[PDB]
Amino acid sequence: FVSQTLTRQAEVRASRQLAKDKVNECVRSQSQRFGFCGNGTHLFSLANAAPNGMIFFHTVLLPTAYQTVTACSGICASDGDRTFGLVVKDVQLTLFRNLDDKFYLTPRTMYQPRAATSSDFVQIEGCDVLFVNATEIDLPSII
Amino acid sequence: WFLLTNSSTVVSGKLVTRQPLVVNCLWPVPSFKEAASTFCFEGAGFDQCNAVLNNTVDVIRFNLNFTADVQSGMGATVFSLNTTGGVILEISCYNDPRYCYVLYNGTTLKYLGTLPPSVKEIAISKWGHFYINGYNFFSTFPIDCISFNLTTGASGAFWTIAYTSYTEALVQVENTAIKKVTYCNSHINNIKCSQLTANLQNGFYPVASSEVGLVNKSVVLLPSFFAHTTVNITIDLGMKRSGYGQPIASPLSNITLPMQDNNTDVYCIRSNQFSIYVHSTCKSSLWDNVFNQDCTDVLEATAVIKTGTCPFSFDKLNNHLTFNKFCLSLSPVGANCKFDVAARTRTNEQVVRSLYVIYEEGDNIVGVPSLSVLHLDSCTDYNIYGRTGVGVIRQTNSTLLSGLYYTSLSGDLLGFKNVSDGVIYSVTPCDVSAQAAVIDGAIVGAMTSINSELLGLTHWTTTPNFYYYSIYNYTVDCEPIITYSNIGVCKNGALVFINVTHSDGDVQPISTGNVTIPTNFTISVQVEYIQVYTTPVSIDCARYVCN
Amino acid sequence: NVTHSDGDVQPISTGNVTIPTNFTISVQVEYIQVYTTPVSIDCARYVCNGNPRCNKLLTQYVSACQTIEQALAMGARLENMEVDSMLFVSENALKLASVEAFNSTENLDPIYKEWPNIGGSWLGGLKDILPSHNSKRKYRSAIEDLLFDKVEDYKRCTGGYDIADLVCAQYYNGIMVLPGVANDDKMTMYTASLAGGITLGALGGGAVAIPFAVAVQARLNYVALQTDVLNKNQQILANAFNQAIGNITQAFGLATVAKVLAKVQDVVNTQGQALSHLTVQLQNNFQAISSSISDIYNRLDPPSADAQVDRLITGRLTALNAFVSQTLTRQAEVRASRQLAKDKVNECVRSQSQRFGFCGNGTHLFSLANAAPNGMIFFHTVLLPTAYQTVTACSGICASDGDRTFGLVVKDVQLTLFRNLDDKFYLTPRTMYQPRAATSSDFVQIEGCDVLFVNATEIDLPSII
Amino acid sequence: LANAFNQAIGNITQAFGLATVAKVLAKVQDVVNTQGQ
Amino acid sequence: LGFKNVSDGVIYSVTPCDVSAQAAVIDGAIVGAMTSINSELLGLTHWTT
Amino acid sequence: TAIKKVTYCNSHINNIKCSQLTANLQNGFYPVASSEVGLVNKSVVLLPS
Amino acid sequence: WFLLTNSSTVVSGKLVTRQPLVVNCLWPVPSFKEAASTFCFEGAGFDQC
Numbered sequence A: 001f002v003s004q005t006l007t008r009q010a011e012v013r014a015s016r017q018l019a020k021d022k023v024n025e026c027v028r029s030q031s032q033r034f035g036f037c038g039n040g041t042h043l044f045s046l047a048n049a050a051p052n053g054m055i056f057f058h059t060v061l062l063p064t065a066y067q068t069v070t071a072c073s074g075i076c077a078s079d080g081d082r083t084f085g086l087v088v089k090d091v092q093l094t095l096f097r098n099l100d101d102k103f104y105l106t107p108r109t110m111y112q113p114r115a116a117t118s119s120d121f122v123q124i125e126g127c128d129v130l131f132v133n134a135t136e137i138d139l140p141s142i143i
Numbered sequence B: 001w002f003l004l005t006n007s008s009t010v011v012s013g014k015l016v017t018r019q020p021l022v023v024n025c026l027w028p029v030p031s032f033k034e035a036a037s038t039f040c041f042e043g044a045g046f047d048q049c050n051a052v053l054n055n056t057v058d059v060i061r062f063n064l065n066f067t068a069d070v071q072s073g074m075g076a077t078v079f080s081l082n083t084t085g086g087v088i089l090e091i092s093c094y095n096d097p098r099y100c101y102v103l104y105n106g107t108t109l110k111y112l113g114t115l116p117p118s119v120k121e122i123a124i125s126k127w128g129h130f131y132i133n134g135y136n137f138f139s140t141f142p143i144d145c146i147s148f149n150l151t152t153g154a155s156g157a158f159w160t161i162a163y164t165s166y167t168e169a170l171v172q173v174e175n176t177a178i179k180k181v182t183y184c185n186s187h188i189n190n191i192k193c194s195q196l197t198a199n200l201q202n203g204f205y206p207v208a209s210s211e212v213g214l215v216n217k218s219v220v221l222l223p224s225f226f227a228h229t230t231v232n233i234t235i236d237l238g239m240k241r242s243g244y245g246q247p248i249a250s251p252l253s254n255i256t257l258p259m260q261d262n263n264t265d266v267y268c269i270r271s272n273q274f275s276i277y278v279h280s281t282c283k284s285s286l287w288d289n290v291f292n293q294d295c296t297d298v299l300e301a302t303a304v305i306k307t308g309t310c311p312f313s314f315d316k317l318n319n320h321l322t323f324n325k326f327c328l329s330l331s332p333v334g335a336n337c338k339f340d341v342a343a344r345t346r347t348n349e350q351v352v353r354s355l356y357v358i359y360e361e362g363d364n365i366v367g368v369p370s371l372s373v374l375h376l377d378s379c380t381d382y383n384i385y386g387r388t389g390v391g392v393i394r395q396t397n398s399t400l401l402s403g404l405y406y407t408s409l410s411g412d413l414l415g416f417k418n419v420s421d422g423v424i425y426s427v428t429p430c431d432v433s434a435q436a437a438v439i440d441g442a443i444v445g446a447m448t449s450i451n452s453e454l455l456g457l458t459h460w461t462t463t464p465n466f467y468y469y470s471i472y473n474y475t476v477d478c479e480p481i482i483t484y485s486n487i488g489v490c491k492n493g494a495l496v497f498i499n500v501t502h503s504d505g506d507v508q509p510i511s512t513g514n515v516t517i518p519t520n521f522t523i524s525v526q527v528e529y530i531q532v533y534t535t536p537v538s539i540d541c542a543r544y545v546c547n
Numbered sequence C: 001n002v003t004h005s006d007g008d009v010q011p012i013s014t015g016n017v018t019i020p021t022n023f024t025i026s027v028q029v030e031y032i033q034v035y036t037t038p039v040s041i042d043c044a045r046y047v048c049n050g051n052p053r054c055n056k057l058l059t060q061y062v063s064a065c066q067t068i069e070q071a072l073a074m075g076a077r078l079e080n081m082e083v084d085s086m087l088f089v090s091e092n093a094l095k096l097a098s099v100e101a102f103n104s105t106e107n108l109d110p111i112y113k114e115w116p117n118i119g120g121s122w123l124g125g126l127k128d129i130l131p132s133h134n135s136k137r138k139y140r141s142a143i144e145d146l147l148f149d150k151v152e153d154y155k156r157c158t159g160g161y162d163i164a165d166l167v168c169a170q171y172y173n174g175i176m177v178l179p180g181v182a183n184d185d186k187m188t189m190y191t192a193s194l195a196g197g198i199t200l201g202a203l204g205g206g207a208v209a210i211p212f213a214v215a216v217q218a219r220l221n222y223v224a225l226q227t228d229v230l231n232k233n234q235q236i237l238a239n240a241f242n243q244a245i246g247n248i249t250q251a252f253g254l255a256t257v258a259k260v261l262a263k264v265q266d267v268v269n270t271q272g273q274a275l276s277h278l279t280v281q282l283q284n285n286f287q288a289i290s291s292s293i294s295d296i297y298n299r300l301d302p303p304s305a306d307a308q309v310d311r312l313i314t315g316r317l318t319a320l321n322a323f324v325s326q327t328l329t330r331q332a333e334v335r336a337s338r339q340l341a342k343d344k345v346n347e348c349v350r351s352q353s354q355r356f357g358f359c360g361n362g363t364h365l366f367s368l369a370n371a372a373p374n375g376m377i378f379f380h381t382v383l384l385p386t387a388y389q390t391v392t393a394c395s396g397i398c399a400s401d402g403d404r405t406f407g408l409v410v411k412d413v414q415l416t417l418f419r420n421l422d423d424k425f426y427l428t429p430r431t432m433y434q435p436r437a438a439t440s441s442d443f444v445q446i447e448g449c450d451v452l453f454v455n456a457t458e459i460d461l462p463s464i465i
Numbered sequence D: 001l002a003n004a005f006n007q008a009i010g011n012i013t014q015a016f017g018l019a020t021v022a023k024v025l026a027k028v029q030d031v032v033n034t035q036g037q
Numbered sequence E: 001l002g003f004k005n006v007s008d009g010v011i012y013s014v015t016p017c018d019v020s021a022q023a024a025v026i027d028g029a030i031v032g033a034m035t036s037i038n039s040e041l042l043g044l045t046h047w048t049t
Numbered sequence F: 001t002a003i004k005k006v007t008y009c010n011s012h013i014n015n016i017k018c019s020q021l022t023a024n025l026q027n028g029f030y031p032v033a034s035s036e037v038g039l040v041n042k043s044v045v046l047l048p049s
Numbered sequence G: 001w002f003l004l005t006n007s008s009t010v011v012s013g014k015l016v017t018r019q020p021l022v023v024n025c026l027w028p029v030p031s032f033k034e035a036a037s038t039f040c041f042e043g044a045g046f047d048q049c
């Protein structure tokens, strides 16, 4: 009896650590661990008591449809005889060009676009083959 | 109604038990009627029935409030019992509270006690056991017929008499009372009894694919010379009466073995085959030990031999038990075990003598009932080179050069060789395990290895690793209720196979061409349980071990 | 001795510091168990081998069989649900997830017309990880075939065509091994889909692919923003990868490979022995004249035969209870390792983790996975530095305008500020030497200056304020 | 989002009195049964 | 646990004369105990419920 | 093979020490019997005859 | 050559067993020869090896 009891206590100790991590990362904070707080994009968690433990209610965002945009890997710009590239400073954002030919940035988790500005770009020495050529019309808003 | 027990009583809980809950006949008694009749177990009349099942009755139940209103037409006598010796016993209450006694000729044999003011049930089994409120308070000799004449008279109370038989059932008890009875009489009810559950949850349950009983016997033994001996053991029983009149079997009873080597004291099998019989002779005597009278009345006795300390029974020596040596003796010198020789009478069986056995396990000598009879392609009770069991024996086209027989890791026989031509036979079980698919309290199908009808299921289909029997009309696109792995079973018994969940896919960190960004959102709530703590138990070691 | 290393890079921006610069590829391999192989036991048949008389005695122990069967059935049910909720596929990813798909051009998006196929450079390694049609069984990778080669039907058990083998012999004793093939097939599709999705351009519809090298470059930008766009360092990483997989495939057919092989065979050996141990106990005559119930009933009359069978019944129920306890203990063990396997897929394969040291030893770039007996194999591809670049760091900049003095500090705590040979200010991430010129939006203006700050001059000011 | 949430909880509460609910109920009763036995 | 008197139907209960108890030991001495029986034990005379 | 310390099992606290094979108990809770018995009346109940 | 047993026969598997597998002498017999001799266990001739 004692051996079986001690074995189960070790088992539960491990599941307690998991319950504790779930409270601290899903309920008391906003976790950056993909897939941890349920299947989907985590929004918030609530909890209830249960016999010998607890119940977690993971509220997640579920997409029903996707928006297509035309993305750019970077922008190729020039001033006089000097050519250089501009790339997005924040690697988590997608750069795309709107119907107004203006540059926008959007996070990949939700279609929440904002106009791009100069502080969002990093200037580097060259341009890749997938870069889009900038014109005088765009330059004042991106440099 | 109460459960019948020989010892302690269950206050609450579910138990599978053998109880007289089958009703052959129910005889209700009106408020002002005399329940007077004569009942016999071995062929009841069944004329007063409220469905009637015509069979032998095991128990008669009197379900009435034996208050101070219940009177008998026989006066003091409540019951009159006709037992197997032609003997009449009476159960009677007197007012010198009503005190019940067991009587024979007019004198009292036992005092049972007074009747409690709270008696709701009396059951009399044919083996003489009397149950009051479920408890076996007293017993008599086996009963053939019970006479009774019971009435509540002017009280205007009603009651019933039930004629019942024993069966296995799952019974739910609460406060020492029956609340629910489920009979173990169907394919679904057998699962309920096995699971101690009157209401099964949806799922799969292990069952036997079939039952067996009544088979041919198959015997395979290595060839030898036919050399058969009949061994006639004669037992002369000495019977005398004791002061109470019951029989006593004398220690002076004699055992005579067949004669061997002039002397008789000892006898040995010196043949290849043999059969042993016991011939019973009875003589009676007075008290001077003069066994010159015939046995009659009660001093009638049959000589029988019991097992005693031997790893075999005397009566089974006529099967196909084998030995290298086997001797009987009337003197314990070299004996390996002994048999108990007894005088069996109408009731009591008592030991008079011991018979000593000397033996060595082996195969030179075989007992016989009067061989190599093998029954193929059918279920048989076999004895093959000393290995016994039940199964189906088939001829195979395999070849194994070495050995006589082959067994499994569990010790079971898997096959054997015919020494006359090298043919290999395989041996398989007549019945196998199967998984019954149970949905909403019914069997809708089953998983089996044998292509044979089971559990009342007649329709079937063949899948890659099993046969599936069902209620579904087999010669589906339905939702499964119960599932394991990729196998699901639908409400209508249909079997379906289950794929793996599909999704659109993960959004990748691509910013190079056309890309899709999740846009239109809703809410999904997922629920999970995690165990945090156990319920600790503190044990007092000394008290647990030493109460 | 104990392994030596150079040491961890610290968040120091105060003097001379070293930033990892010249990188190659290292591939680490690990095995995690996901599921056990469940066994369903027929209690009555195991204890009472089809004997109607033993079966009656056994009803006195009806609660013992109920507990044994319920415990095993519930364990298997819970495990089944846990696995079904873990494994899934994407139809488009699964279309791309094959060697033949990767070696073709037809599934590639037109803007990549300058690339011959998907992952051409990386194919020399991927070919042994991705599923192939020209393989054993169906749709498995070269490595999976090696693992499974190194390490079921019941219809045939009632045929009577030959003498039964070990599996049918166990079946006859009430021991059924539940199908695990489906879990093997599901795992193969699961891991293949995860790999295929790396190169899947969009989730709208259409197995439209991007190059593997393009997908890899995206992962490099998560490690550190890449500025040397004119430095085609990708061929080097691809070559190192292909060689690493070559050595791993050869090793299976490298300390990490030895560890995987040891763990995988221990899992199969444990399950085998645990169940064979159950069968040997049926030869045990628990102080009885025989271990065979049928032999007892053919030798003794019921008054004595039942006494002998009763000894076997209690002995066998005890052995059977021991089996169940061991089985349940292992299922709990595996449940814990399943959570780890699930976390590894979600954080190493399906996303870019920020947990240091989680996805192998080194700087994580990407992970691939394969199926294995009772679990899966993870291939952790990490960046391994061979040399470091020294820079002279500044803790901050001390600036002045007229009589007002103030400090400028770097807004992003993960970057090192250093001064170049041109006396210009640059910022670089500490994980890779990938410097960019500093600008005004990268600094925070604070009230004072520390003693470790560098004094700015009129030449720098226009670029940092 | 609020409406979708309210409906989801409605279905969960009803289910207790949804594969995730079935899993919770199975695990919770297994814990109490194991300790009892 | 109990029995019936066959003469009148009265039920009797049977309990242990002694039960397990938890002694509270601090710095080598018993300072109290947890018990189901309202009776002095271990030399302890004061109590609360 | 020499005696260094003897604790007698002659008190409520010393009985715990003997049971625990410990001459110096750590703070905590210990299972004990609430009482001892000895010297009692005999009670016999049998069915009438 | 076969393994010698008193009971059941092993179909497959590895076993540690005591068997007459040590060869003191091997006497081959030609296609047309009579293997006629007298053999004693307690001191064999061993002339045809």
Ligand SMILES: *[C@@H]1O[C@H](CO)[C@@H](O[C@@H]2O[C@H](CO)[C@@H](O[C@@H]3O[C@H](CO)[C@@H](O)[C@H](O)[C@@H]3O)[C@H](O)[C@H]2NC(C)=O)[C@H](O)[C@H]1NC(C)=O
Pocket (backbone or CB within 6 Å): B004, B005, B006, B125, B127
């Ligand atoms: C209370 O205990 C007694 C003895 O321990 C049990 O007595 C036995 O009862 C069974 C079933 O009624 C009798 O079975 C019958 O055996 C004959 C063979 O002689 C067979 O031909 C019949 O078909 C039937 O199977 C058995 O003879 C009897 N033995 C006795 C009188 O000692 C009694 O069953 C137990 N009752 C309860 C409710 O627990």
Ligand SMILES: *[C@@H]1O[C@H](CO)[C@@H](O[C@@H]2O[C@H](CO)[C@@H](O[C@@H]3O[C@H](CO)[C@@H](O)[C@H](O)[C@@H]3O)[C@H](O)[C@H]2NC(C)=O)[C@H](O)[C@H]1NC(C)=O
Pocket (backbone or CB within 6 Å): G004, G005, G006
């Ligand atoms: C088959 O079973 C028989 C009996 O169960 C075994 O018989 C025994 O065989 C052994 C080894 O050949 C004999 O050992 C010898 O014992 C003498 C002592 O008397 C000793 O001096 C010799 O050096 C040697 O150890 C033993 O006497 C013999 N006993 C008999 C004949 O019953 C037989 O070994 C088993 N054979 C196989 C293949 O399983």
Ligand SMILES: *[C@@H]1O[C@H](CO)[C@@H](O[C@@H]2O[C@H](CO)[C@@H](O)[C@H](O)[C@H]2NC(C)=O)[C@H](O)[C@H]1NC(C)=O
Pocket (backbone or CB within 6 Å): A065, A066, A067, A068, B519, B520
């Ligand atoms: C997101 O949801 C909105 C609302 O349903 C969609 O907008 C509608 O789209 C249909 C079909 O083209 C039009 O007929 C309606 O007039 C639109 N409504 C409004 C208010 O604009 C939108 O298309 C969805 N977006 C995606 C990517 O699925």
Ligand SMILES: *[C@@H]1O[C@H](CO)[C@@H](O[C@@H]2O[C@H](CO)[C@@H](O)[C@H](O)[C@H]2NC(C)=O)[C@H](O)[C@H]1NC(C)=O
Pocket (backbone or CB within 6 Å): B034, B036, B037, B072, B073, B074, B149
């Ligand atoms: C059952 O008992 C009653 C007595 O309580 C029997 O009825 C009596 O029978 C005798 C003989 O014929 C008559 O002299 C009495 O006058 C009857 N008494 C009454 C009240 O009528 C009855 O016969 C018995 N039944 C059976 C089947 O024996």
Ligand SMILES: *[C@@H]1O[C@H](CO)[C@@H](O[C@@H]2O[C@H](CO)[C@@H](O)[C@H](O)[C@H]2NC(C)=O)[C@H](O)[C@H]1NC(C)=O
Pocket (backbone or CB within 6 Å): B220, B372, B373, B374, B418, B419, B420, B421
């Ligand atoms: C073992 O094999 C032998 C040899 O084939 C079987 O003997 C034959 O049985 C057939 C069918 O009755 C007879 O017609 C032959 O004459 C028998 N041959 C001889 C030489 O007797 C034998 O029956 C098989 N043993 C069992 C138990 O089936």
Ligand SMILES: *[C@@H]1O[C@H](CO)[C@@H](O[C@@H]2O[C@H](CO)[C@@H](O)[C@H](O)[C@H]2NC(C)=O)[C@H](O)[C@H]1NC(C)=O
Pocket (backbone or CB within 6 Å): A039, A040, A062, A063, B501, B502, B503, B504, B505, C084, C085, C086, C087, C088
């Ligand atoms: C994780 O959640 C996603 C939803 O975000 C599930 O994906 C959906 O699955 C259903 C099939 O049951 C499809 O009809 C939907 O079109 C899918 N939607 C999306 C956006 O993929 C996914 O199946 C869940 N994971 C598991 C293991 O069940």
Ligand SMILES: *[C@@H]1O[C@H](CO)[C@@H](O[C@@H]2O[C@H](CO)[C@@H](O)[C@H](O)[C@H]2NC(C)=O)[C@H](O)[C@H]1NC(C)=O
Pocket (backbone or CB within 6 Å): A070, B513, B514, C111
């Ligand atoms: C991205 O998707 C759009 C579709 O919305 C593509 O646009 C079409 O391109 C073809 C070129 O053959 C034109 O003939 C069509 O008129 C375009 N418009 C529409 C509304 O379909 C676009 O080419 C795709 N581009 C990239 C880089 O992925």
Ligand SMILES: *[C@@H]1O[C@H](CO)[C@@H](O[C@@H]2O[C@H](CO)[C@@H](O)[C@H](O)[C@H]2NC(C)=O)[C@H](O)[C@H]1NC(C)=O
Pocket (backbone or CB within 6 Å): C003, C004, C005, C006, C007, C361, C362, C384, C385
């Ligand atoms: C983790 O990986 C690092 C490589 O990044 C290992 O460090 C190398 O170890 C070898 C000795 O086997 C040295 O010769 C190299 O110079 C080390 N390189 C660096 C950059 O430190 C490290 O040993 C690995 N960790 C463990 C536990 O083995």
Ligand SMILES: *[C@@H]1O[C@H](CO)[C@@H](O[C@@H]2O[C@H](CO)[C@@H](O)[C@H](O)[C@H]2NC(C)=O)[C@H](O)[C@H]1NC(C)=O
Pocket (backbone or CB within 6 Å): C015, C016, C392
């Ligand atoms: C950082 O390292 C450089 C070496 O690359 C040091 O530069 C040398 O400093 C000494 C000062 O005694 C000069 O004499 C040398 O000429 C310098 N140049 C070279 C190429 O060695 C520098 O001093 C170190 N500084 C800090 C703050 O760590």
Ligand SMILES: *[C@@H]1O[C@H](CO)[C@@H](O[C@@H]2O[C@H](CO)[C@@H](O)[C@H](O)[C@H]2NC(C)=O)[C@H](O)[C@H]1NC(C)=O
Pocket (backbone or CB within 6 Å): C099, C103, C123, C127
């Ligand atoms: C990728 O496809 C090419 C063909 O386009 C394969 O190369 C051919 O391999 C066959 C042998 O099976 C040779 O007979 C041909 O001559 C080769 N052709 C060329 C152009 O090299 C190549 O092996 C495939 N690679 C993989 C990993 O499948």
Ligand SMILES: *[C@@H]1O[C@H](CO)[C@@H](O[C@@H]2O[C@H](CO)[C@@H](O)[C@H](O)[C@H]2NC(C)=O)[C@H](O)[C@H]1NC(C)=O
Pocket (backbone or CB within 6 Å): C242, C243, C244, C245, C246, C247, C250
């Ligand atoms: C195992 O890795 C080694 C590198 O450490 C591989 O050897 C290299 O092979 C390439 C050709 O593909 C040569 O150009 C290099 O010069 C070799 N380097 C060394 C140090 O030998 C080796 O081929 C790999 N093993 C397998 C099976 O691919």
Ligand SMILES: *[C@@H]1O[C@H](CO)[C@@H](O[C@@H]2O[C@H](CO)[C@@H](O)[C@H](O)[C@H]2NC(C)=O)[C@H](O)[C@H]1NC(C)=O
Pocket (backbone or CB within 6 Å): C021, C022, C387, C388, C389, C390
């Ligand atoms: C990173 O690797 C490059 C290439 O090997 C190194 O650059 C070479 O360094 C040697 C030694 O000073 C010079 O002789 C070569 O001419 C350099 N090659 C080129 C193309 O510049 C570089 O020094 C390494 N950097 C570090 C920090 O180890």
Ligand SMILES: *[C@@H]1O[C@H](CO)[C@@H](O[C@@H]2O[C@H](CO)[C@@H](O)[C@H](O)[C@H]2NC(C)=O)[C@H](O)[C@H]1NC(C)=O
Pocket (backbone or CB within 6 Å): D006, D007, D008, D009, D010, D011, D014
């Ligand atoms: C379970 O969820 C469904 C939605 O999937 C709920 O049904 C909706 O109920 C609202 C009213 O509150 C209606 O306006 C919607 O049209 C319904 N939708 C569908 C598809 O039927 C359902 O009420 C929820 N169950 C519970 C108990 O709340």
Ligand SMILES: *[C@@H]1O[C@H](CO)[C@@H](O)[C@H](O)[C@H]1NC(C)=O
Pocket (backbone or CB within 6 Å): A131, A132, A133
């Ligand atoms: C940008 O301009 C150059 C000429 O300087 C041209 O070769 C290149 O193709 C242009 N890029 C794009 C995307 O059109």
Ligand SMILES: *[C@@H]1O[C@H](CO)[C@@H](O)[C@H](O)[C@H]1NC(C)=O
Pocket (backbone or CB within 6 Å): B082, B086, B088
């Ligand atoms: C008792 O039964 C016997 C039959 O065995 C019968 O001859 C006898 O008359 C019966 N006696 C009574 C009082 O019923």
Ligand SMILES: *[C@@H]1O[C@H](CO)[C@@H](O)[C@H](O)[C@H]1NC(C)=O
Pocket (backbone or CB within 6 Å): B105
């Ligand atoms: C009953 O007892 C009397 C005593 O007077 C005796 O004469 C008679 O024979 C006995 N009856 C039986 C059946 O033994």
